[PDB]
Design a protein around this ligand. Structure first.
Ligand SMILES: *c1nc(F)c(C#N)cc1F
Ligand SMILES: *c1nc(F)c(C#N)cc1F
Ligand SMILES: *c1nc(F)c(C#N)cc1F
Ligand SMILES: *c1nc(F)c(C#N)cc1F
Ligand SMILES: [Zn+2]
Length: 191
């Protein structure tokens, strides 16, 4: 089974956004639709809707491998990092993606597909945007985990039953030098 990655604004006009960045622990490339971040550092992601969704609407994040030959493999923390004593009290140690600073985050191990995801209630903005803070708890290069394979994060807006209301996505590289790696990959896209 493979989760869909098709962008879908839906009835509420749902989409993601990133603030600008160029020392950096996280930086987003619009040209590559790709977030570059350090291990276990805050990644702020903005959520936009055109219209306020109903109470009980939630926002779920899930990682999948980007390459088609790995898409059925569950993205999980590597054998090293899953044994770290780095629990926040809520995230199970196998989950790559955490939400920080939200006590209502729930973590799902899907009983059928075995995929991991983290979901929070969707709340109205303060402002014009809602921000969620994600952490990525493994490097892209971790052997026995992502093993240098690219991943996508899929962000879904869902009703209280889990039915799809909206979807957006971005590629992620978790690496020691996000600013340098962004500049290298944007230069490759240029040439
Ligand atoms: C890290 N990464 C980003 F993409 C942003 C933005 N916008 C902020 C940050 F700290
Ligand atoms: C996992 N957990 C830790 F606590 C450390 C340290 N120090 C490293 C690690 F990979
Ligand atoms: C989630 N939930 C909401 F209520 C809004 C609004 N308004 C945005 C969102 F991303
Ligand atoms: C705040 N948050 C967002 F996600 C967008 C977009 N797209 C715009 C905004 F002002
Ligand atoms: Zn790891």
């Amino acid at each position: 089974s493979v989760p869909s990655q098709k962008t879908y604004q839906g009835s509420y006009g749902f989409r993601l956004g990133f603030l600008h960045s160029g020392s950096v622990t996280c930086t987003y490339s619009p040209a590559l639709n790709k977030l570059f971040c350090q291990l276990a550092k805050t990644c702020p992601v903005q959520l936009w809707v055109d219209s306020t969704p109903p109470p009980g609407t939630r926002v779920r994040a899930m990682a999948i491998y980007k390459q088609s030959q790995h898409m059925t493999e569950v993205v999980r923390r590597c054998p090293h990092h899953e044994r770290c004593s780095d629990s926040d009290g809520l995230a199970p140690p196998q989950h790559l993606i955490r939400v920080e600073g939200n006590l209502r985050a729930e973590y799902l191990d899907d009983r059928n597909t075995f995929r991991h995801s983290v979901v929070v209630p969707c709340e109205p903005p303060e402002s014009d945007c809602t921000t969620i803070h994600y952490n990525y708890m493994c490097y892209s290069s971790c052997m026995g985990g992502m093993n240098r394979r690219p991943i996508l994060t899929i962000i879904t807006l869902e009703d209280s039953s889990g039915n799809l209301l909206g979807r957006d996505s971005f590629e992620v590289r978790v690496c020691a030098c996000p600013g340098r790696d962004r500049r290298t990959e944007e230069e490759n896209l240029r040439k």
